[PDB]
Ligand binder design. Structure first.
Ligand SMILES: CN(C)C(=O)c1ccccc1NC(=O)OCc1ccc(C(=O)O)cc1
Lengths: 213, 211
């Protein structure tokens, strides 16, 4: 079966610029290649068929090219609504097969995270567990480092992190970091700190509380 | 106005079968084929059925796994998946051949794990925190299967919301959601996270009260 390769997992672009996504077929597929757009939780949407034909209703900002083994999707004047994952597919022969996807990233001005820390709720402590939560919201660029410190010492055990998809409105990123302790463990220490390192500050961004307060 | 409406998410045990539907409307059902695709967090083509003439074709990889049928009387295409394993957990779509009409997807979860409603914990700032804005949150802990839906004030707080992807541990999911509001509206006015978990048919509301 035919392997369709999209070597770029991500491609970054400013709005209003041109971006191209490539796709390679492992053997000849003629012009029987389609491109699709997909946003989180939605079905894909057809952009291009027959390698270079625009599906009805697709903006003329989208074009496609190639024949045989080498294909390209080009988006001119990239718009916010183009933030999506892009897939190629061959239908020259069965079984039909798809590329692995390329996610667009939108460039924007640097933005510092807004960092917020939360002690364990009273409710949670009643069942014996203690999660300390930190949100690091609306930052750019996407790279960020978060450290937890308990009475001054770094802790990794028990930390679970999660990251939103790039925001479709403002092109920022957000992260949550959750440190889960037992209640007894939690109550044996005082200062809890979430410390973020981001290129927007030479100094880490620190939020803390003291359990004893 | 073609519409393809698929059946709801399903949680089934390993070794069982499931039958997913795709109800088509808005065109002549016997004049177009319907294809099926699998998407695991990429995309795989399963096969098609052409209701008009009964032609069915499978990707060889799915030939002892999937069985495609169609009921012309109800314009509904069906895909039965047999001998299920965790490898079959995925989103399944139906799609009309050639035309850009797709179902909304059906998420299948194959697992032995018990359906568990979430425990929801309010996240209020510490007693000694603090400017013009305040961030609050909700920790949505210990549920299975996915998903949950989180809102704030039943949807009336829409801006400034971040609901994070869930993390899986010991057969249970956890996520958090944050909301940021002006300080003049909290705590003097109510702020409540609303958490629905369809698989257990629950919805839980947790008011964020200052600590
Ligand atoms: C025709 N076709 C291959 C399908 O319907 C299709 C079916 C399942 C998965 C992807 C598909 N891919 C797809 O739809 O690509 C778009 C497309 C649209 C029109 C034509 C055509 O008219 O030749 C070909 C491809």
């Amino acid at each position: 079966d035919i392997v369709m390769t999209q070597s770029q997992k991500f491609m970054s672009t400013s709005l209003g610029n041109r971006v191209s996504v490539t796709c390679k077929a492992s053997q000849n597929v003629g012009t029987n290649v389609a491109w699709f757009q997909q946003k989180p939780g939605q079905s894909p949407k057809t952009l291009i068929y027959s390698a270079s034909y625009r599906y009805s209703g697709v903006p003329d900002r989208f074009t496609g090219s190639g024949s045989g083994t080498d294909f390209t999707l080009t988006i001119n004047n990239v718009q916010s609504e183009d933030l999506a994952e892009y897939f190629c597919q061959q239908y020259n022969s069965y079984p039909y097969t798809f590329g692995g996807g390329t996610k667009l990233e939108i460039k924007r001005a640097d933005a510092a995270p807004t960092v917020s820390i939360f002690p364990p709720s009273s409710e949670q402590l009643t069942g014996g567990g203690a999660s300390v939560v930190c949100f690091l919201n609306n930052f750019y660029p996407k790279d960020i480092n978060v450290k937890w410190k308990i009475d001054g010492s770094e802790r990794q055990n028990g930390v679970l992190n999660s990251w939103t998809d790039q925001d479709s409105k403002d092109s920022t990123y957000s992260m949550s970091s959750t440190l889960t302790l037992t209640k007894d463990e939690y109550e044996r220490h005082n200062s809890y700190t979430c410390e973020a390192t981001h290129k927007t500050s030479t100094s880490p961004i620190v939020k803390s509380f003291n359990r004893n307060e | 106005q073609v519409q393809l409406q698929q059946s709801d998410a399903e949680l089934v045990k390993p070794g069982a079968s499931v039958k997913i539907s795709c109800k088509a409307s808005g065109y002549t059902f016997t004049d177009h084929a319907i294809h099926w695709v699998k998407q695991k967090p990429g995309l795989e083509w399963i096969g098609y059925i052409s209701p008009g003439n009964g032609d069915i074709k499978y990707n060889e990889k799915f030939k002892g796994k999937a069985t495609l049928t169609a009921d012309k009387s109800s314009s509904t295409a069906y895909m039965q998946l047999n001998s299920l394993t965790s490898e079959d957990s995925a989103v399944y779509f139906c799609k009309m051949e050639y035309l850009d009409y797709w179902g909304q997807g059906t998420t299948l979860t194959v697992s032995s794990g018990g359906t568990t409603p979430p425990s929801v914990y309010p996240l209020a700032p510490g007693s000694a925190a603090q400017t013009n804005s305040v961030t609050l949150g909700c920790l949505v802990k210990g549920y299975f299967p996915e998903p949950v839906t989180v809102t704030w004030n039943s949807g009336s707080l829409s801006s400034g919301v971040h609901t994070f992807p869930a993390v899986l541990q010991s057969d249970l999911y956890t996520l958090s959601s944050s909301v940021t509001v002006p300080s003049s509206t909290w705590p003097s006015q109510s702020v409540t996270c609303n958490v629905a978990h369809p698989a257990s048919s629950t919805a839980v509301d947790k008011k964020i009260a200052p600590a």
